[PDB]
Amino acid sequence: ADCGLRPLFEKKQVQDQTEKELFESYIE
Amino acid sequence: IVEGQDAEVGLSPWQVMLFRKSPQELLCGASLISDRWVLTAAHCLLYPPWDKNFTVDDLLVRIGKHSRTRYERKVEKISMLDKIYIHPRYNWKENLDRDIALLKLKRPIELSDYIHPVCLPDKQTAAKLLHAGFKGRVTGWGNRRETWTTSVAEVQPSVLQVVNLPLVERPVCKASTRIRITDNMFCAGYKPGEGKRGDACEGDSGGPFVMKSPYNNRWYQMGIVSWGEGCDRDGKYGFYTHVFRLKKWIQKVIDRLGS
Amino acid sequence: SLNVLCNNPHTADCNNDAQVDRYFREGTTCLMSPACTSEGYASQHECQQACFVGGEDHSSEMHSSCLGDPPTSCAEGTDITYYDSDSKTCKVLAASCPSGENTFESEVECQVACGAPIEG
């Protein structure tokens, strides 16, 4: 979209392998 | 990328190989901040101590690639530049402060399924994501090791590589290198004993260090791969140009062109 | 990233270390300068193995498209950039139509795609 949105993923609503890691690290 | 892994097709639509005309070789990497502009690390083009002063008549920007070498017929959208802007306060001589530079693509890229821009961070987005512990993603076409023997386990990667590295506390970065550290450069990497290794390396200079937002779901680019003491070295960490600090500049640069 | 190790700190004197001769990439190659046993690298190879990008292996970019038949002069032919398997270079044939995939959209794009030396 206006920026930072991957067609083949966020748009399509699919998550890439190593994506969950970045979220777990947000424990704060 | 040391100890990283093969990146899924289309995983990093903002990746921009920074190619060199003759020889046809790989010089760096970079992010596509907008169909028009490309954001890369200054020292990629300017670093006298190594006979390094690249003019627009040498750089080619292959965008949206995946394999390191093989031409991807209808995916990569090659391109030539127009203008090269490096930060005026670029301290290459001392500790590469403000290792940022903007490359104006000649013809606005035809945005597509594989070529798509990141989002530069802003106070809000920044403030929430820039806390030590939080991981990030570094992707580049660099070598897998610092040094090696007879290309053991093959050094140069077939395709783009990825590795999520957590940001470390500034006091730790400061305390890990004799080198001067400024507020325009955060560092990221695992601590000894932490278990997980991983770090950028020669060939990733310019690579975008991105971080996905947990709120608006956008992938932001927080740091540019800048400098480092060897690759994956225990006790050492990678230094990334702090994009946000330099945001004001990025703007100052683009807005002057017109409207 | 800039492998800072390459640049010789030129530190005064190694306190509890020795000023042994080490190699640090200067200008366009590794050269032995004296320094502390840790600073820099210990082998003409090691330094060039860690201070250069080394993108110089089997980067066989010559795509299959390159080996296709050259455009043919066709009735409603246009400018068509192709790789000349003879001249080992990319050319432009006017009033031509694509006889396959040996058709690139530009001089440069072609040159890299088939590794032919890029020009200006």
**Dihedral (CA of B54, C39, B196, A23) sign:** negative
Asked if chain B contacts chain A via 3 or more Cβ pairs within 8 Å, the reply is yes
Helix (H, G, I), strand (E, B) or coil at B162: strand
Question: For tokens 């570094």, what's the residue?
Answer: B138
Does domain C2-53 fall into CATH 4.10.410.10?
Answer: yes
Tell me the C-alpha distance between C74 and C97, whole Å. 5
| Interchain contact A14–B (C-beta under 8 A) | no
| Interchain contact B134–A (C-beta under 8 A) | yes
Shared-domain flag, residues B213 and B189: yes
Q: Which residues of B27-66 are buried (b: 16+ CB within 10 A; e: fewer)?
A: bbbbbbbbbbbbbbbbbbbebeebeeebeeebbbbbbbbb
Shared-domain flag, residues B104 and B166: no
**Is B43 assigned a catalytic role?**
yes
Range of the domain at B71: 13-117+245-259
Q: How far is CA B48 from CA A12, B92, B117, C11, C53, in A?
A: 45, 8, 31, 21, 17
**Partner residue opposite A28 with nearest CB, options B9, B131, B211:** B131
Structural contact between residues B128 and B215, judged by C-beta atoms closer than 8 angstroms: yes
**Partner residue opposite A22 with nearest CB, options B114, B117, B211:** B211
For chain C, helix (H) and strand (E) counts, in that order, are: 2, 5
Does domain C63-120 fall into CATH 4.10.410.10?
Answer: yes
For chain A, helix (H) and strand (E) counts, in that order, are: 1, 0
Question: Side chain identity at B184, as an amino acid letter?
Answer: N
Comparing CA positions, the residue from B85, B93, B91 lying closest to residue B36 is B85
Q: List, by residue range, all CATH 4.10.410.10 domains of chain C.
A: 2-53, 63-120
Provide Rg for chain A, Cα atoms.
Answer: 11
Q: Nearest chain C Cα to B27, which residue?
A: C53
Chain C environment of B69 (Cβ under 8 Å): 58-61
Number of C-beta neighbours around residue A9 at 10 A: 18
Q: What DSSP state is assigned to residue C86?
A: T
User: Inter-chain contact A25–B135, Cβ cutoff 8 Å?
Assistant: yes
**Dihedral (CA of C53, C55, C56, C57) sign:** positive
Data resolution in angstroms: 3.1
Shared-domain flag, residues B88 and B174: no
In the numeric block, which tokens belong to residue B26? 């790989």
What is the maximal distance between C-alpha atoms in chain C? 81
Separation of CA C70 from chain center: 27
Number of C-beta neighbours around residue C64 at 10 A: 11
User: Which residues 6+ apart lie within 8 Å of B65 measured at CB?
Assistant: B15, B17, B72, B75, B76, B160
Tell me whether the omega of the peptide bond preceding residue B23 falls within 30 degrees of 0, making it cis. yes
Q: Nearest chain C Cα to B48, which residue?
A: C27
Residue B258 belongs to domain with CATH number: 2.40.10.10
User: Inter-chain contact B227–C2, Cβ cutoff 8 Å?
Assistant: yes
Beta bridge partners of B18: B28, B61
Interface with chain C: mutation pick from B47, B69, B202, B204, highest number of C CBs within 10 Å: B202
Shared-domain flag, residues B77 and B155: no
Tell me the C-alpha distance between B98 and B103, whole Å. 15
Min distance B246 CA to chain C CA atoms (Å)? 19
In the numeric block, which tokens belong to residue B222? 């927080």
Q: How far is CA B101 from CA B90, B167, B194, B206, B207, in A?
A: 9, 23, 34, 9, 12
Helix (H) or strand (E) holding B240: strand B238-242
Q: How far is CA A19 from CA B143, B200, B214, C5, in A?
A: 23, 18, 11, 32
